[PDB]
Amino acid sequence: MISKEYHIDEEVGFALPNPQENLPDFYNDWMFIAKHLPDLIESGQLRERVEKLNMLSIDHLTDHKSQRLARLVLGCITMAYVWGKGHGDVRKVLPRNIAVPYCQLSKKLELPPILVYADCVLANWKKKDPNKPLTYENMDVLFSFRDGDCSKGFFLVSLLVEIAAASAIKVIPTVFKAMQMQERDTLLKALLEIASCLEKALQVFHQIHDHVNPKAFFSVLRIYLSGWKGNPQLSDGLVYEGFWEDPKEFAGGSAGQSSVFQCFDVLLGIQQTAGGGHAAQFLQDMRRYMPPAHRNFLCSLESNPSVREFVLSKGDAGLREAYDACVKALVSLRSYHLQIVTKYILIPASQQPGGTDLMNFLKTVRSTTEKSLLK
Amino acid sequence: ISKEYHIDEEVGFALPNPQENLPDFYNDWMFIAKHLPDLIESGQLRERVEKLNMLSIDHLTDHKSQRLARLVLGCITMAYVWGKGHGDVRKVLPRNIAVPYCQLSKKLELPPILVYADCVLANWKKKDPNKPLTYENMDVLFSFRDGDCSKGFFLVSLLVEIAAASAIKVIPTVFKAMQMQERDTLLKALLEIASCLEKALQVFHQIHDHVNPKAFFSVLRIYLSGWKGNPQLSDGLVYEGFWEDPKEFAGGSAGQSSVFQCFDVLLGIQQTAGGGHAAQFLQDMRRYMPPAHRNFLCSLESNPSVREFVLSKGDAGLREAYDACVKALVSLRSYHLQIVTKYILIPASQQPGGTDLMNFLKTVRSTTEKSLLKEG
Ligand code: HEM
Ligand code: HEM
Ligand SMILES: CCS(=O)(=O)N1CCC2(CC[C@@H]([C@H]3c4ccccc4-c4cncn43)[C@H]2O)CC1
Ligand SMILES: CCS(=O)(=O)N1CCC2(CC[C@@H]([C@H]3c4ccccc4-c4cncn43)[C@H]2O)CC1
């Protein structure tokens, strides 16, 4: 098994198992706002409500799940506060009574004070029926921004893809064991199981079309997920009033912050973070938005010997095909994902009364993946 | 420390006993690198580079031959791009050098530009193998121009690196001491770290004896500069035959030194935390370190915090030992600010950026100073 210090679950992987839904009564004022964001944003009540909050101590968030729930709560409120109704009117200062505890909590959890993938995908879910499986029909999100924002469809499909990819994480100890022990057959089997899970993860992705509408995604949800790093709207970042004097820049959410896909790039020696380029820089930076235990797990994988070099050295057609099957699965995922971006970003952007830079980043990452094929 | 991190007992992150000569196959590269001052001064460097045939990197069969080739190709690239360093600039690196350089850079997981690991850590030799690592028993392998003080700059940098790196071997003692709750051992370890970082500063004092401000500013500064955020090459460098579009890569920085980054990490200074530019920059420079050295840094980040261990213990002895380490880093950076004033700011004022560079350095110094438990 993988060590407990990396906080990787057997079933959900890097996802938070059975996320907490309710905070202690002490934090009811936070909970009320986060639970009613759609109506409070729409009616222009959200900002005054956040401004009228009292500064609450984080000390009564006594465990990890409560701290992670609070991060999800405060992060959603923070996006609602900064972006407002999502029409380009921006708050440049986050008031101290929310900014201070959010920054304190974020420092405690070693995550930046902005909504991350680990909040809004990995900790933002529940089973409707605990006795039924982790499927879309038996799941809901904990928080959404606006009515019709398609956040359920986006967050849950993202979660399910993550969970399907994560079924191969438990094979990783076997891989490195098989290399050190020079176990060709064990390694071959292990690589075939990884390809199977990454192939399965692609089929899970196909659901996105059923539960997310392009127009709503582009015009609404995209807005609330965006951040303030290299964002012309918040040129210098956001002022977290009372914590830092200067405005601070933090990137909005990205599945670049997903540890599973970074994990298999590392495992397969794809070297996405190597070389000093723009795309590498971004994906390396995104590791700071991951929970520290998961950050550490990626670092650990990078310190182990290369699977790619092991397979490359061996003159073993069986191993090369199994290796290549893992790489092909990552390329196919990334290729399908590009087609998603065309449908959900490029086309809606063209229809409104940038895209190329986003596509080029994704194509760089895909190409680096394809270029790791041995055959 | 595991041998997979490629940290030497004597020279730490430096490459022990660097290779001086490449295989005969690469003589054409070696000639240009060995005669850069002569070729630049005669206006023959660019022609010589352009006359090169594309040589395969497959005959560079070990890590040291590859690190030497990187240093050679890196120095040739700086000379080719910058020329005589008067503003006559090349935006296209010819394919016959660009291809092998990028191929080799990919193999070693480094950006295709001269980095600290090339021009400091791999750019040296002992004169007498039987004598210690001192300035007078050492030389650099490559310089750019005559009188550029590259020996002084690169070797003093290396000596400071090595002095500081004597503390690296203590790091596993620190974590073992913590995990095992060995207070006296941890205290002794932290005092040794402080001693070495204090020694590094004394070694730094030698810079004044071997580098002249004018030569440094007007000559060497040029050849060390890169093409990331540089108006001279706004869109970066075209590496002909490897990539179609120009690529931006940062010039050398001792932010690329793994020793100072590792002690920041060890002492919980957290230079790469938060939403500021200094953090981003120091984070980016890790990409310009050799991969095993990158790995080592992140592995230190995964161990428990020394700072939070010391903060928890109500132990004046431990706190003082901890602060002596932090103070040693503060003293180095404060001294380094004076060095920037002498070697950059003053020459710049005398000529017929500086604020930005000093603001960056002050932010990093401040982050260090603010990790002190007690006022220094
Ligand atoms: C409406 C659906 C989606 C759209 C429009 C979309 C769009 C984008 C865009 C524009 C980027 C580049 C900017 C950034 O990093 O934030 C990106 C990155 C990324 N996305 Fe998505 N995405 C969607 C859903 C998903 C899903 C379900 C996955 C799960 C596989 C995913 C995986 C990734 C990964 C791993 C990256 C980082 C680059 C890479 O590793 O290839 N995305 N996405
Ligand atoms: C002529 C001598 C030197 C001058 C003019 C100089 C100047 C500078 C400048 C302008 C920077 C900021 C830009 C950059 O990162 O490249 C810098 C960074 C840095 N320098 Fe130097 N430097 C000199 C020598 C040294 C030496 C010998 C050391 C060894 C201690 C050193 C250590 C550092 C470190 C560690 C950084 C990154 C910021 C930090 O960690 O504080 N420098 N230097
Ligand atoms: C860059 C400003 S932008 O306005 O052009 N812009 C880019 C497109 C997105 C769409 C989803 C979002 C990101 C994310 C946030 C949270 C949870 C999962 C995922 C995810 C999965 N793939 C990508 N993302 C981000 O890439 C929104 C913001
Ligand atoms: C920004 C373009 S600039 O022209 O203003 N400019 C900044 C000042 C420097 C001075 C040395 C150099 C860097 C370095 C390169 C190789 C080996 C060790 C070290 C080193 C140590 N401290 C700093 N550096 C860089 O920071 C030159 C270029």
Curated annotation (Swiss-Prot), chain B:
| Record keywords, A-Z | Cytoplasm, Dioxygenase, Heme, Immunity, Iron, Metal-binding, Oxidoreductase, Tryptophan catabolism
Q: In which pathway does it act?
A: Amino-acid degradation; L-tryptophan degradation via kynurenine pathway; L-kynurenine from L-tryptophan: step 1/2
- Domain of life (superkingdom): Eukaryota
Gene3D superfamilies, A to Z: 1.20.58.480
* Activity control: Activity is inhibited by and MTH-trp (methylthiohydantoin-DL-tryptophan), modestly inhibited by L-1MT (1-methyl-L-tryptophan) but not D-1MT (1-methyl-D-tryptophan).
Q: In which tissues is it expressed?
A: Expressed in mature dendritic cells located in lymphoid organs (including lymph nodes, spleen, tonsils, Peyers's patches, the gut lamina propria, and the thymic medulla), in some epithelial cells of the female genital tract, as well as in endothelial cells of term placenta and in lung parenchyma. Weakly or not expressed in most normal tissues, but mostly inducible in most tissues. Expressed in more than 50% of tumors, either by tumoral, stromal, or endothelial cells (expression in tumor is associated with a worse clinical outcome). Not overexpressed in tumor-draining lymph nodes.
Q: Where does heme b bind?
A: H336
Instruction: State whether it acts alone or in a complex, and with which partners, per the record.
Output: Monomer.
Q: What does this protein do?
A: Catalyzes the first and rate limiting step of the catabolism of the essential amino acid tryptophan along the kynurenine pathway. Involved in the peripheral immune tolerance, contributing to maintain homeostasis by preventing autoimmunity or immunopathology that would result from uncontrolled and overreacting immune responses. Tryptophan shortage inhibits T lymphocytes division and accumulation of tryptophan catabolites induces T-cell apoptosis and differentiation of regulatory T-cells. Acts as a suppressor of anti-tumor immunity.
Q: What is the protein's given name?
A: Indoleamine 2,3-dioxygenase 1
Organism whose genome encodes this protein = Homo sapiens
